[PDB]
Design a protein around this ligand. Structure first.
Ligand SMILES: CCCCCCCCCCCCCCCCCC(=O)OC[C@H](COP(=O)([O-])OCC(O)COP(=O)([O-])OC[C@@H](COC(=O)CCCCCCCCCCCCCCCCC)OC(=O)CCCCCCCCCCCCCCCCC)OC(=O)CCCCCCCCCCCCCCCCC
Ligand SMILES: CCCCCCCCCCCCCCCCCC(=O)OC[C@H](COP(=O)([O-])OCC(O)COP(=O)([O-])OC[C@@H](COC(=O)CCCCCCCCCCCCCCCCC)OC(=O)CCCCCCCCCCCCCCCCC)OC(=O)CCCCCCCCCCCCCCCCC
Ligand SMILES: COC1=C(OC)C(=O)C(C/C=C(/C)CC/C=C(/C)CC/C=C(/C)CC/C=C(\C)CC/C=C(\C)CC/C=C(\C)CC/C=C(/C)CC/C=C(/C)CC/C=C(/C)CCC=C(C)C)=C(C)C1=O
Ligand SMILES: CCCCCCCCCCCCCCCCC[C@@H](O)O[C@H](CO[C@H](O)CCCCCCCCCCCCCCC)COP(=O)(O)OCC[N+](C)(C)C
Ligand SMILES: CCCCCCCCCCCCCCCCC[C@@H](O)O[C@H](CO[C@H](O)CCCCCCCCCCCCCCC)COP(=O)(O)OCC[N+](C)(C)C
Ligand SMILES: CCCCCCCC/C=C\CCCCCCCC(=O)OC[C@H](COP(=O)(O)OCCN)OC(=O)CCCCCCC/C=C\CCCCCCCC
Ligand SMILES: CCCCCCCC/C=C\CCCCCCCC(=O)O[C@H](COC(=O)CCCCCCC/C=C/CCCCCCCC)COP(=O)(O)OCCN
Ligand SMILES: CCCCCCCC/C=C\CCCCCCCC(=O)O[C@H](COC(=O)CCCCCCC/C=C/CCCCCCCC)COP(=O)(O)OCCN
Lengths: 83, 175, 98, 115, 171, 113, 105, 318, 347
């Protein structure tokens, strides 16, 4: 409780560079696990169309697959524009 | 066939290898290895591997700097040897150059199985793939896949590097 | 196979012969070892680029990494040898017989 | 092709500068003039004698740390992967062990030059 | 190993689309909106047959639809499109963001004269469905018959007859 | 002491916010031009198929003319047992052509700077 | 010798990198993906001894894709006959193999 | 027409180096309460030409104990590499457009040290040897930290293409997001160009002249042309990295002028620093780079890897 | 060395061996070998002296050359078939290079020269590790590629190893060099049966490891590294010399002792493949190993050598550190012939 406070005071007085390094590294380790925008980064990465979207053959049993890019079905990037 | 730039680069690669394998003073051997690293970077770049060639060149530049320092510390003598100051070194250099010449001649003028298999020539350009697509570099994607596919490789490599630091600490301790 | 593949294989053979045929300095042999590693890097990179095997684009880099380890290891040993004799001559390593 | 031409041009320009330096001026070379410089006097020993390195351990450590540079430069491309949680864990893990190896060498007096 | 069958030069002929890449990039969004059906049919043929020789007529239809699209653009308003693709062509990387006014004028023209709506962000990258009369290829890889496996292990496990039967061991 | 650190962190946060906005916009623009490429891809695929097929046919006709005197040579004979399409090796496409366009097809993209 | 821990635990430590036809980033295919796929499906489950004999066709095609030795020999033969014919003047190369073609997009 | 571009690059760089000698002399003079060169030409404008003509008409000496091949090769390597360092720099358009321009700069910079190493060794003199070994120590000190700093900074660019750095900084200078890194980066450049307070391989007051003590006349002049060209090049690279000038595709001269002004400011800052501070000890440089710069650099690399993922701000172009 | 650092290095050596023996990818096997070597070098130099440094340098040079050859063979195999899996080498040149690299790592003739010197230059615990644990990885790799090996080359190297082990051991007064030559001969025996039956290779490896562990532990207990130093042990610990004599008889392969079981199982196996001349020569050559084992037993236990006065003081003190597995090791090294059929559990 008070021992760690004295140790931190001593380290800040003698080696501030190491204190800053440890604080920044600790924040870098811990903060991503508590951020709501990490999932947004994953979704943005998955939204980048590097290769061609190969069409699927219609078998008459695909209600959720669009027949045209402008059809309402399929994924939507509305969330990305407002971001 | 196509200006044989890659063939020239590979020949210079072999020449630098002969330069440092004839084993003159490690100053000149380090220079020969630097020349080989540069021409190998060029060879890899001519095949589409820009990152790999540049990185191997950078790594070998650092390694040869450390080797130069260590040579000045521990591998010097009164009269460091060059390729023409010693009959053994000159003999090894000339023998390597001539046997490279023999292999090149016997491979390009006729088709023979040297040790493994045969060769006719035709230049490198024949074995290319003519694929046409992409907003990225396949080499960069494959290298960056180390952080998503190669978790096991990252683990073993990092452990080996940490252990290497500990090992060099232990070996040079003395006592 | 192209002339470039045989040139790289010849480079490896030359470096191996240089390592196996010793002279006085141990540093020269260490340079031959590093040259063998360089030739292996070049050859594997050429094969992997030619066949477009995407996931092995990382293995030459890992190769390089362990090359460094060897180099470091060797240099460490050389230091100790020098500290015993004042030279890095392989002749001095004759305390142990067969 | 353009880079090869650039390298050839630069090397040629430097080589011609050296040629001009060695062929334009009048040369009056003698043994006293060409002798080694040590500020007024003849050197006692040879300059090819062993010169001890006090930072030899740091030089070896630099070799291992220079290859950590090889493992981290693909990071800008690795940030474009879908499974960011895995790559971030492995990217952070690799930097942690580098920090631990530096901490190990620092605490064991490895960064101190030989006396 | 057999003779490789190749099409004649006559049936490889088609009316080429002879516009440069900047023009294509300027028209690309509306082109992917309008000519979707033949392009998707051709690409389905392409990834199903795995053979360029088996999807030539679909490629010809792709060319024809692209030519009709560009002819319709040329008929209705060519000047706004020309300014737009000139602005696009100036850029060394051919950036959309540097030509927004000309793009707005072109979009307004094609909306008023043709009812063409520019696809939103995320639409041209959707995986879509294609209805085709082309039969699904049976053996696209031209695979040989797979060799028969080793039959199986079957039956109950009995103790070894007279044990191990090593030299003198009775068990 | 306190003021200097406070100004530094304030500047850092302002920069972080600005770069977050700009990088999100950059990602949107990249998605847009990737979509433009996706829309253009089928036409390029069709033309590439026709170009490769025509080059192969011209090579086949020239090889038929050239190799009529050799006795036991099959015109257009494959080197593979399988009968499926094999993507042509670029050496086959440009085997009977001039050096400059072979240098082009081989090293044009790598050497373009 | 080989303690097969991966299959026992379903871990997949290094099997993702063993073959050319296995799950590349961004679905980038290998140069010989179809040949290796055919050879692997031919040889699966029948053992190495049987595979060396009964999948020789697939493996030979895969090796030809890998090294292209037969292709290079055939191209060399065609080029040699063309050079022999041109030197005597019997055969004349056409305009479209001399740089005078009509290019197409 | 490409050779015309090669010449239009290399020749103005040499004139800029020649007049940077004058600019540094006058700046140090005025910071030392004097004037500096003002007699040879109006305001000393002809002093660089006189210096060059004197150096290239003076006798070069080949030392008796020297190894002549490296003794001649090293200045050629130095000057040629110094000229080569400029070809990927976008001003705003580069002479050579590379996917990995940053890595090319790193590799060529790592290769340029061997000029000093080989000149010092092939001089076969004790002071030149001491200078060469100090160059070894200096590279060991700065290389790893400089590479990791550059990686951390470029994590927000999205690639290693130098021209992309213009697009990255269209609305804000990157120094506002990474001013700690820039700080160390600046010091690293000081160590990389062998400039005060890190001019240890030269060390006039310690080793007469260090690695180039045996050099005279033309090769000597070549070594200084290489060093000053490297100073300008590194400051221009810093200006591109951290002080992003707005670029208009129809009026690129505005970008060129803004870039040149920023590079001049950084070079004058180098001269100011040389005028202001004492010299480091060469083990103290190693301790500064390995015990203060390296831990902070590692922590900031961790932070700059995590930050774009935490804030959903990853750049494009995988 | 710090005990924690020593434990870390030992576990890194073991982890490299495990990585070799659990990997299906050639690159990971290579990495396992590199990790093993990197952690192994400091263990040889734990007791710092010029001899340990020379031994470590020779060992590293040999193993690094072998690793270069091994990676070259891997790359050639990949070139002639885009394969990374360790099944069966597709190129005979690559197979020859791989066999030579693995023989160099194991120390088979004619790449045996380093085995005695290194074993002489290190401590007895380091020698125990070097002669027992360091054989597992190359032998496992050889077992995995057994069908691909050319029998002529492997059998030539095995016969040379047996002959050279016997002849070299005949000349030795130092115990570490005796153990090294014994190791070379046993490695030849192991690699002779590899193309025919890998279970026999594993059985021989286990038996040899048990007997080698017993001998090294007995030599550490009676801290003797020369014949004359071991000749004093009867006057301080007669039980130790008796156990050592019995274990030496077992190592020579004499029935009814355990050391007879591997050779008996190997010769027999070879006769199932119409191989008679090689087994006959192999046994007749192992007679040399038996001879120098018998000479050591003569000097150590079957006769009594003169002692020294100060030995009286040693009579008053016990052994501070006790070896838990030494009794089990001795019993397994001698009395397991009746349990021979249990080898079926090894396949
Ligand atoms: C306490 C005693 C007790 O409870 O014993 C019950 C147990 C009950 O025996 P059982 O199954 O009713 O009688 C079977 C007969 O022995 C009939 O014998 P079996 O057919 O059951 O034989 C078992 C078999 C397998 O038995 C064995 O392998 C182990 C037997 C000992 C081997 C000899 C050395 C040890 C003495 O024995 C052999 O194969 C004969 C070969 C023996 C030589 C093996 C190689 C070494 C040769 C010398 C060197 O009897 C013993 O244990 C006898 C002492 C052993
Ligand atoms: C293939 C076959 C071999 C090709 C050799 C390449 C051409 C160089 C041959 C001429 C140099 C030797 C002349 C000489 O000794 O003094 C002449 C003469 C005799 O002086 P001296 O005082 O009467 O007698 C002194 C003693 O004899 C002894 O005095 P010393 O101790 O000074 O002599 C040492 C010299 C004596 O030469 C020898 O010992 C035998 C020559 C064999 C050298 C080859 C070794 C392999 C090294 C790697 C492979 C390099 C590529 C080779 C392929 C060439 C095609 C590109 O050996 C060397 O040090 C030559 C080193 C050349 C390497 C240059 C590489 C530049 C590094 C830049 C970084 C690389 C970037 C990555 C790529 O003095 C002069 O006239 C002035 C010196 C002239 C030097 C000018 C520049 C050096 C030559 C150009 C190098 C190539 C640039 C491309
Ligand atoms: C504190 O005192 C000191 C100073 O202050 C008074 C210094 O300046 C100083 C540095 C030395 C100076 C006197 C500078 C010397 C001037 C240069 C060496 C001349 C360089 C000029 C040429 C070599 C450049 C090229 C010449 C051409 C005209 C350029 C165009 C090239 C063509 C091919 C086109 C030192 C060391 C010093 O100690
Ligand atoms: C059984 C005994 C357990 C304890 C002893 C273990 C001894 C070995 C040390 C650790 C073993 C690691 C085995 C796990 C291999 C990792 C691969 C697998 O688990 O999945 C990865 C999971 O990765 C996770 O990040 C876990 C890795 C975290 C481990 C790092 C620190 C722990 C190592 C500590 C010991 C190592 C030496 C000492 C280091 C200080 C990635 O999965 P994902 O990307 O979703 O999908 C891949 C498929 N894709 C690419 C097609 C999409
Ligand atoms: C910026 C970089 C590019 C610049 C562009 C120009 C590049 C110039 C190349 C560099 C050389 C110029 C140096 C200037 C002086 C010339 C040096 C030399 O070539 O001249 C003499 C060359 O003379 C030769 O030694 C002998 C003369 C003849 C030798 C036979 C060669 C074939 C000539 C046959 C003549 C027939 C007619 C030829 C014309 C059609 C050497 O005399 P030497 O005393 O040693 O050395 C000291 C020179 N001094 C006197 C000026 C101080
Ligand atoms: C010395 C080493 C020089 C290193 C050169 C690297 C140059 C470079 O990186 O440019 C890459 C450039 C373009 O690639 P990217 O832009 O990244 O992507 C391709 C899409 N446009 O690639 C190329 O043009 C490669 C051209 C061949 C490489 C040059 C090889 C030069 C080798 C030097 C040999 C000189 C003689 C040998 C000995 C020298 C001294 C004795
Ligand atoms: C959880 C995240 C971790 C990852 C982030 C870290 C990234 C990289 C940072 C570490 C790099 C390596 C660190 C090296 C450690 C040095 C050890 C050492 O030797 O320390 C002594 C000095 O002793 C110290 O270590 C200083 C104090 C103790 C360490 C520093 C503080 C530790 C953590 C403090 C901050 C904790 C978090 C911040 C809390 C803020 C308040 C809520 C060195 O001084 P000498 O050279 O021996 O002295 C001779 C000349 N006088
Ligand atoms: C919300 C999360 C945010 C993340 C954290 C962000 C905040 C970080 C706060 C700390 C940042 C500090 C960065 C500075 C890095 C170096 C600091 C340092 O400690 O270095 C000094 C030394 O560094 C120097 O002073 C350099 C000496 C040479 C100076 C040369 C000229 C001075 C610089 C002139 C102006 C620089 C302009 C740079 C910008 C240019 C634009 C690109 C340590 O050495 P010592 O004092 O001796 O003590 C340590 C051992 N006891």
């Amino acid at each position: 409780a008070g021992r760690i406070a004295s140790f931190l005071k001593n380290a800040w007085a003698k080696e501030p560079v190491l204190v800053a390094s440890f604080a920044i590294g600790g924040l870098a380790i811990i903060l991503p696990s508590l951020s709501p925008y990490t999932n947004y980064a994953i979704r943005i990465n998955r939204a980048t169309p590097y290769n061609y979207p190969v069409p699927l053959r219609d078998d008459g049993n695909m209600p959720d697959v669009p027949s045209h890019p402008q059809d309402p079905q399929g994924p939507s990037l509305e969330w990305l524009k407002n971001l | 066939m196509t200006m044989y730039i890659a063939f020239i680069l590979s020949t210079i690669f072999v020449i630098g290898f002969v330069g440092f394998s004839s084993k003159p003073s490690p100053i000149y051997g380090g220079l020969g290895l630097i020349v080989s690293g540069g021409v190998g970077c060029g060879i890899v770049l001519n095949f589409g591997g820009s990152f790999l060639g540049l990185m191997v060149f950078l790594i070998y530049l650092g390694g040869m700097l450390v080797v130069f320092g260590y040579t000045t510390a521990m591998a010097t003598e009164m009269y460091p040897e060059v390729w023409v100051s010693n009959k053994t070194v000159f003999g090894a250099f000339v023998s390597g150059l001539m046997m490279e010449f023999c292999m090149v001649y016997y491979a390009l003028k006729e088709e023979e199985v040297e040790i493994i298999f045969k060769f006719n020539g035709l230049g490198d350009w024949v074995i290319y793939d003519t694929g046409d697509s992409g907003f990225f570099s396949e080499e960069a994607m494959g290298i960056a896949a180390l952080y998503s596919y190669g978790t096991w490789l990252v683990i073993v490599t990092g452990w080996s590097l940490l252990i290497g630091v500990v090992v060099i600490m232990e070996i040079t301790r003395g006592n | 196979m192209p002339l470039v593949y045989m040139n790289i294989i010849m480079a490896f053979a030359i470096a191996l012969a240089g390592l196996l045929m010793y002279r006085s300095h141990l540093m020269s042999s260490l340079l031959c070892l590093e040259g063998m590693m360089l030739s292996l890097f070049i050859m594997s990179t050429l094969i992997i680029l030619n066949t477009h095997f995407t996931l092995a684009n990382m293995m030459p880099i890992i190769l390089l990494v362990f090359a460094a380890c060897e180099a470091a290891l060797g240099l460490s040993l050389l230091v100790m040898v020098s500290n015993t004799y004042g030279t890095d001559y392989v002749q001095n390593l004759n305390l142990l017989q067969c | 092709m353009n880079i090869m031409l650039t390298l050839l041009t630069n090397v040629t320009l430097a080589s011609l500068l050296v040629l001009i330096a060695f062929w334009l001026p009048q040369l009056n070379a003698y043994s006293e003039k060409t002798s080694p410089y040590e500020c007024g006097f003849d050197p006692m020993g040879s300059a090819r004698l062993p010169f001890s390195m006090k930072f030899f351990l740091v030089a070896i450590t630099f070799l291992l740390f220079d290859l950590e540079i090889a493992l981290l430069l693909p990071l800008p491309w690795a940030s474009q992967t879908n499974n960011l949680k895995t790559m971030l864990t492995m990217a952070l893990f690799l930097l942690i062990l580098l920090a631990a190896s530096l901490a190990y060498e620092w605490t064991q007096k490895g960064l101190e030059w030989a006396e | 190993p057999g003779i490789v069958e190749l099409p004649t030069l006559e049936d490889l002929k088609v009316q080429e689309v002879k516009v440069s890449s900047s023009v294509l990039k300027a028209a690309a969004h509306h082109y992917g909106a309008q000519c979707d059906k033949p392009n998707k049919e051709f690409m389905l043929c392409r990834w199903e047959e795995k053979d360029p020789r088996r999807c030539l007529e679909e490629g010809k239809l792709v060319n024809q639809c692209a030519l009709d699209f560009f002819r319709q653009i040329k008929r209705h308003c060519a000047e706004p499109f020309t300014e737009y693709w000139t602005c696009i062509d100036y850029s060394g990387l051919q950036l959309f963001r540097h030509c927004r006014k000309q793009q707005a004028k072109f979009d307004e023209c094609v909306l008023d004269k043709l009812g063409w709506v520019r696809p939103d962000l995320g639409e041209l990258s959707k995986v879509t469905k294609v209805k085709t009369d082309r039969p699904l290829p049976e053996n696209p890889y031209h695979s040989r018959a797979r060799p028969e496996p080793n039959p199986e292990a079957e039956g109950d496990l009995k103790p070894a007859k007279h044990g191990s039967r090593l030299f003198f061991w009775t068990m | 002491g306190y003021s200097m650190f406070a100004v530094g962190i304030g500047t850092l946060l302002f920069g972080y916010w600005s770069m977050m906005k700009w990088n999100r916009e950059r990602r949107r623009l990249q998605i847009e031009d990737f979509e433009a490429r996706i829309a253009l891809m089928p036409l390029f695929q069709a033309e590439k198929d026709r170009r490769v097929l025509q080059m192969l046919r011209e090579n086949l006709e020239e090889e038929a003319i050239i190799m009529k005197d050799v006795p036991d040579w099959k015109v257009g004979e494959s080197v593979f047992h399988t009968t499926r399409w094999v993507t042509p090796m670029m050496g086959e496409l440009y085997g009977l052509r001039t050096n400059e366009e072979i240098l082009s097809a081989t090293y044009g993209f790598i050497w373009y700077t | 010798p080989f303690f097969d821990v991966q299959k026992r635990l379903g871990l997949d430590l290094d099997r993702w990198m063993t073959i050319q036809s296995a799950e590349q980033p961004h679905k980038i295919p290998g140069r010989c993906h179809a040949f290796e796929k055919e050879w692997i499906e031919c040889a699966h489950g029948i053992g190495g001894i049987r595979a060396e004999k009964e999948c020789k066709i697939e493996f030979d095609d895969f090796v030809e894709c890998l090294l292209r030795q037969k292709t290079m020999k055939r191209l060399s033969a065609i080029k040699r006959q063309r050079d022999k014919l041109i030197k005597e003047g019997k055969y004349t190369p056409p305009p479209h193999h001399l740089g005078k073609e009509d290019p197409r997009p | 027409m490409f050779m015309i571009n090669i010449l239009s690059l290399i020749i103005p760089i040499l004139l800029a180096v020649a007049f940077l000698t004058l600019v540094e002399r006058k700046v140090l003079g005025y910071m030392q309460l004097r004037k500096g060169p003002n007699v040879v030409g109006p305001y000393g404008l002809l002093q660089p030409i006189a210096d060059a003509l004197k150096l290239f008409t003076k006798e070069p000496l080949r030392p008796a104990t020297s190894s002549i091949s490296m003794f001649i090769i090293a200045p050629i390597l130095a000057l040629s590499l110094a000229l080569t360092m400029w070809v990927p720099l976008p001003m705003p358009y580069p002479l050579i457009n590379m996917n990995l321009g940053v890595l090319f700069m790193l590799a060529m910079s790592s290769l340029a040290v061997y000029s000093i190493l080989w000149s010092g060794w092939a001089s076969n003199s004790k002071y030149a040897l001491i200078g060469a070994l100090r160059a070894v120590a200096q590279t060991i000190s700065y290389e790893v930290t400089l590479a990791i700093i550059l990686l951390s900074v470029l994590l927000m660019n999205g690639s290693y293409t130098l021209s992309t750095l213009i697009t990255t900084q269209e609305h804000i200078w990157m120094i506002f997001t990474s001013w700690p890194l820039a700080m160390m980066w600046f010091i690293s450049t000081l160590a990389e160009t062998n400039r005060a307070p890190f001019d240890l391989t030269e060390g006039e007051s310690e080793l007469v002249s260090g690695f180039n003590v045996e050099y005279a006349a033309g090769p000597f002049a070549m070594f200084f042309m290489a060093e000053y060209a490297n100073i300008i090049m590194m400051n221009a690279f810093t200006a591109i990295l951290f002080l992003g000038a707005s670029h208009d595709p129809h009026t690129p001269e505005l970008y060129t002028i803004n870039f040149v002004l920023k590079t001049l400011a950084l070079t004058i800052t180098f001269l100011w620093i040389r005028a202001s501070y004492p010299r480091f000890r060469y083990d103290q440089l190693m301790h500064l780079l390995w015990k203060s710069f390296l831990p902070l650099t590692l922590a900031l690399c961790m932070w700059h890897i995590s930050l774009p993922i935490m804030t959903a701000s990853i750049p494009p172009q995988s | 060395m710090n005990p924690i650092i020593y434990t870390t290095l030992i576990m890194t050596v073991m982890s490299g061996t495990m990585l070799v023996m659990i990997s299906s990818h050639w690159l990971l096997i290579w990495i396992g070998f590199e990790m093993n070597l990197l952690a192994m070098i400091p263990v040889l130099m734990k007791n710092f002296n010029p001899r340990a440094t020379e031994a470590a340098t020779k060992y590293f040079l040999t193993q690094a050359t072998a690793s270069m050859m091994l990676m070259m063979a891997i790359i050639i195999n990949l070139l002639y078939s885009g394969q990374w899996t360790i099944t069966k080498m597709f190129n005979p040149v690559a197979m020859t290079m791989m066999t030579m690299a693995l023989a160099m790592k194991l120390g088979l003739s004619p790449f045996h020269f380093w085995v005695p010197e290194v074993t002489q230059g290190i401590s007895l615990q380091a020698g125990l590790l070097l002669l027992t644990w360091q054989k597992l990885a190359p032998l496992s790799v050889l077992c995995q590629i057994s069908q691909s090996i050319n029998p002529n080359l492997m059998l030539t190297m095995a016969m040379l190893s047996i002959l050279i082990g016997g002849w070299g051991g005949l000349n030795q007064t130092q115990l570490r060099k005796i153990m090294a030559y014994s190791s070379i001969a046993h490695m030849g025996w192991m690699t002779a049966v590899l193309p025919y039956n890998t279970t026999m290779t594993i059985l021989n490896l286990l038996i040899y490891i048990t007997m080698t562990l017993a001998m090294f532990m007995l030599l550490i207990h009676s801290s003797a590294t020369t014949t004359l130093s071991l000749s004093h042990t009867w006057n301080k610990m007669p039980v130790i010399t008796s156990l050592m004599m019995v274990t030496l008889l077992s190592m020579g392969g004499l029935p009814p002792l355990s050391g007879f079981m591997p050779k008996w199982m190997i010769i027999q196996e070879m006769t199932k493949n119409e191989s008679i001349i090689m087994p006959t020569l192999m046994a007749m050559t192992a007679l040399l190993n038996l001879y120098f084992y018998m000479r050591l037993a003569y000097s150590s236990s079957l006769t009594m050598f003169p002692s020294t006065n100060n030995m009286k003081m040693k009579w008053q003190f016990e052994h501070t550190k006790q070896m838990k597995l030494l009794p089990t090791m001795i019993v397994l090294s001698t009395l397991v012939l009746p349990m021979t059929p249990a080898l079926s559990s090894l396949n």
